[PDB]
Design a protein around this motif. Structure first.
Motif, PDB file in Angstrom:
ATOM      1  N   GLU A 118      -1.859 -17.386 -23.965  1.00 38.36           N
ATOM      2  CA  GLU A 118      -1.142 -16.964 -25.159  1.00 38.36           C
ATOM      3  C   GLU A 118      -0.513 -15.591 -24.961  1.00 38.36           C
ATOM      4  OE1 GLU A 118      -0.102 -17.693 -29.376  1.00 38.36           O
ATOM      5  OE2 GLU A 118      -0.604 -18.867 -27.589  1.00 38.36           O
ATOM      6  N   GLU A 119      -0.996 -14.851 -23.967  1.00 39.05           N
ATOM      7  CA  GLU A 119      -0.464 -13.539 -23.704  1.00 39.05           C
ATOM      8  C   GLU A 119       0.791 -13.730 -22.901  1.00 39.05           C
ATOM      9  OE1 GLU A 119      -2.670  -9.677 -22.365  1.00 39.05           O
ATOM     10  OE2 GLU A 119      -2.420 -10.897 -20.583  1.00 39.05           O
ATOM     11  N   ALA A 120       0.745 -14.642 -21.955  1.00 41.97           N
ATOM     12  CA  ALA A 120       1.876 -14.885 -21.131  1.00 41.97           C
ATOM     13  C   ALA A 120       2.981 -15.467 -21.958  1.00 41.97           C
ATOM     14  CB  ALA A 120       1.513 -15.808 -20.018  1.00 41.97           C
ATOM     15  N   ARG A 121       2.620 -16.344 -22.864  1.00 46.67           N
ATOM     16  CA  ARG A 121       3.550 -16.980 -23.726  1.00 46.67           C
ATOM     17  C   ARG A 121       4.247 -15.964 -24.589  1.00 46.67           C
ATOM     18  NH1 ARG A 121       3.482 -23.054 -24.514  1.00 46.67           N
ATOM     19  NH2 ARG A 121       5.053 -23.290 -26.155  1.00 46.67           N
ATOM     20  N   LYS A 122       3.483 -15.119 -25.233  1.00 46.67           N
ATOM     21  CA  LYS A 122       4.051 -14.090 -26.062  1.00 46.67           C
ATOM     22  C   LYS A 122       4.995 -13.183 -25.299  1.00 46.67           C
ATOM     23  CE  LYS A 122       2.695 -10.462 -29.252  1.00 46.67           C
ATOM     24  NZ  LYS A 122       1.561  -9.575 -29.596  1.00 46.67           N
ATOM     25  N   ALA A 123       4.661 -12.868 -24.069  1.00 47.64           N
ATOM     26  CA  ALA A 123       5.495 -12.007 -23.273  1.00 47.64           C
ATOM     27  C   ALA A 123       6.864 -12.607 -23.056  1.00 47.64           C
ATOM     28  CB  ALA A 123       4.839 -11.731 -21.954  1.00 47.64           C
TER      29      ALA A 123
END
Length: 220
Positions: A118-123
């Motif tokens: 979800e962090e990668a996605r948000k980035a």
């Protein structure tokens, strides 16, 4: 019509671009659809290098790469409405931003789906949003307060950027974000209706829900 054939998977932003250009020039053509599950033999011999669509066949000669095809059409049917800007600088800006869109912005948007966390996605989403801010500013400079990136008339950059609008909205909807809003992209919001409603666009422009449901078919 038989003088001009367009090979293309569908739906696809890249295939949409020559369809719009042909429409702008009022050029009759037959649309040859690449169907899921196999590459046609015509594709394999028209685009042996990349094996992908769009391929425009003009008198049995193949022209590949969506933007290369758009400029080919602009040049060959030079009687009709101009697709590229007429001034050398404006053209360079138009080519610059289409290249940014194809090499950086759209690959980043398409990577959202493959993000591991979800962090990668948000980035990734943040990066797509920042590209839109860049594109809002490009629209301000290019449009000069007129309807389109091309000015009063739909142009090359409208085609390049507009072709992705359906996929932008689908990924917005499926991720629950609004990347294009009134505060940060007011000009693009307005232009997106101008583009999608355009007579040379509206019959080849995809329903957002269509692309969402289709992404789910592809998920195999």
């Amino acid at each position: 019509k038989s003088d001009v054939k367009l090979l293309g998977a569908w739906p696809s932003p890249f295939v949409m671009r020559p369809r719009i250009a042909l429409n702008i020039k009022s050029v009759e053509y037959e649309f040859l659809e690449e169907t899921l599950g196999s590459k046609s033999q015509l594709l394999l011999e028209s685009n042996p290098v990349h094996k992908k669509t769009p391929v425009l066949i003009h008198g049995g000669k193949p022209i590949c790469e969506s933007l290369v095809i758009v400029e080919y059409i602009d040049e060959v049917w030079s009687p009709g409405p101009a697709i590229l800007p007429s001034d050398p600088y404006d053209r360079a800006l138009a080519r610059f931003w289409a290249a940014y869109l194809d090499e950086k912005w759209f690959p980043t948007m398409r990577n959202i789906a493959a993000a591991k966390d979800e962090e990668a996605r948000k980035a990734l989403i943040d990066q797509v949003g920042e590209g839109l801010v860049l594109l809002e500013d490009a629209f301000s400079k290019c449009s000069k307060g007129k309807g389109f990136f091309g000015g009063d008339q739909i142009g090359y950059l409208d085609i390049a950027f507009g072709s992705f609008l359906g996929w932008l909205r689908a990924i917005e909807k499926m991720n629950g974000v609004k990347l294009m809003d009134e505060t940060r992209t007011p000009g693009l919001l307005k232009w997106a209706n101008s583009f999608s409603s355009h007579p040379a666009v509206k019959d080849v422009f995809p329903e957002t829900e269509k692309l969402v449901e289709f992404a789910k078919v592809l998920a195999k």
